[PDB]
Amino acid sequence: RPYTLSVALPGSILDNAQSPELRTYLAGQIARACAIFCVDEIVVFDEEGQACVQLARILQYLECPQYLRKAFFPKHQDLQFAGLLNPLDSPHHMRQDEESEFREGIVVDRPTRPGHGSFVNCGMKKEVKIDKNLEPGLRVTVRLNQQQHPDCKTYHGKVVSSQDPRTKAGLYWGYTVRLASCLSAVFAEAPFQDGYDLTIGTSERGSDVASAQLPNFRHALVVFGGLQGLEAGADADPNLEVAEPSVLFDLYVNTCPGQGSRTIRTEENILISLAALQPGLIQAGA
Amino acid sequence: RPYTLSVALPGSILDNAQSPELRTYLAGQIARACAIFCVDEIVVFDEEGQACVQLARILQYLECPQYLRKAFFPKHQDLQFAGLLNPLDSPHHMRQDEESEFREGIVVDRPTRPGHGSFVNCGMKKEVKIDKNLEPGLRVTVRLNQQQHPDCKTYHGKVVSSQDPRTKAGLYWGYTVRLASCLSAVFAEAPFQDGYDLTIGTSERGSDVASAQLPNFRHALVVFGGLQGLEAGADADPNLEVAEPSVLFDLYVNTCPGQGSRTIRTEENILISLAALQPGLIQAGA
């Protein structure tokens, strides 16, 4: 299985926006930054919190394919500016008329005939029929059979792991989103039994990324502070009694030497930092 | 003299914004990207055009220190959303109460006494008096004398090259902005007699930036295409009869291998590309 990369950042960044419209745009900028770099997981953490819930909600809306949005998100006041947004244009976001090996779907909520598998809509012209009888409203990944009876009232396909499009066909297939009550929860509530075997924090107080060597790894995590830096969710977390955030991570880096602004915003810092790291990440995640 | 770096991009990117507010924010994102990376020059070029004039205007507003904005920009409808913007927080943007070796100023438009030098305001509590009698309304760079008669009705300082804060004290001191009628004007209308001795264009069609070696250089230029790529201002320019933009530049790079979005927006692409290049630029510009 290929390496994973997870990004963590505070919900509080949305409090800095200057209008609701831009509050939405900024959440959009995060999603795009993470998608461009093929991030597997985004962790929004409370820097000790509706900022966190809103940010996560937006992130999930944008990851979810369009044909599934009506079904998966009731109208909210967090998605009222959904429109003013940039698409991720990720490999799993396709038109109805686009031929593809795999497609996300939702299982229709119907009885079905006794032996028979579920009905799933993958935004194709016809529902897709499958192998198994699964609990409805649930989101799945379907691999469409290559032979498609030209007359059939449905298409046919098989449900598969959601890792398969990455691992089997090299395709980025979106991120997941995880809420964490604090900075220590970002590490502790990690989705891999494993642990995150490589953690990297960013700071203008850190060491030149040029002079950093990454250890071999399976699950990388990169953590961004707010406007107030990683110090704020570190002081404020009671499980962390430290005089500086350096020690929390395997590496602590400044990813933009000799910046010409006093401050880098975190939607800025995600692009710069992931760029500066991408080679590094690529050669160590072997 | 240290190396220079110039960024070029099309005005037409503003046509893609979805609201005037965001049209302004996006121009803001450009300025910030260029400031973070200490860019010396931004060239906005017409991809054969009010988009270009608006973008340039915004860029110049944001570079100009705040105490000089009233003086240098009449109220326009291009700066009506000036407010909804992010400051560059660049080394030449200081409070009135911030002690600094150098400060930008404007020469007051007054006669003065026959021998005597000009009056300049550098947003200090008192006007600054200088060495020379200069033509008024003109923008200058002032180095304040170290000894400051504590009673004097004015401070005293000397006008200096605007390169001095970079070259002498390592300080980023802003960019200039240049309009170009077409893609060939970006190269031809260059501000260095010299030429730009290193040109780099960006494309997902280009070669991995990992595998690129930069030649020694003095004046680098990096060029971004629109939504439609560099092809559009290349076909449309009549001085350029080529089947592909590769050949226009010394290097043609893809700066984000295996992206998980079909498209990178150019305010995105500036951050990623300059990051991916920064080391490279640093070691060749010796």
Residue numbers in the entry:
A (entry chain A), B (entry chain A): 71 to 118, 136 to 373
Paper passage:
SPOUT1/CENP-32 localized to mitotic spindles and kinetochores, and its depletion by siRNA resulted in unusual centrosome detachment from the mitotic spindle poles, delayed anaphase onset, and chromosome segregation errors. Our SPOUT1/CENP-32 structures also reveal that SPOUT1/CENP-32 dimerizes via a helical segment in the catalytic domain that packs almost perpendicularly against an equivalent segment from its dimeric counterpart.
To assess if the observed activity is specific and depends on SPOUT1/CENP-32’s ability to bind its cofactor SAM, we mutated Ala356, an amino acid residue located at the centre of the SAM binding pocket, to Asn (an amino acid residue with a relatively longer side chain; A356N) and characterized this variant by determining its crystal structure and by subjecting it in our MTase activity assay. The crystal structure of SPOUT1/CENP-32 A356N determined at 2.5 Å resolution, showed that while this variant does not affect the overall structure or the conformation of SAM binding pocket, the variant protein failed to stably bind SAH in the expression host (E. coli), confirming the perturbation of cofactor binding. We tested the SPOUT1/CENP-32 A356N variant in our MTase activity assays and observed that this variant shows reduced activity, indicating that the specific catalytic activity of SPOUT1/CENP-32 depends on cofactor binding. We tested the A356N catalytic variant in our siRNA rescue assays to check whether the methyltransferase activity of SPOUT1/CENP-32 is necessary for its function. Depletion of SPOUT1/CENP-32 and induction of SPOUT1/CENP32 A356N-GFP expression in our stable cell lines failed to rescue the centrosome detachment and micronucleus formation phenotype. Thus, SPOUT1/CENP-32 methyltransferase activity is required for maintaining spindle integrity. As expected, we also observed reduced cell viability for cells expressing SPOUT1/CENP32 catalytic variant (SPOUT1/CENP32 A356N-GFP) with reduced methyltransferase activity. These data together indicate that the role of SPOUT1/CENP-32 in regulating spindle organization is dependent on its methyltransferase activity.
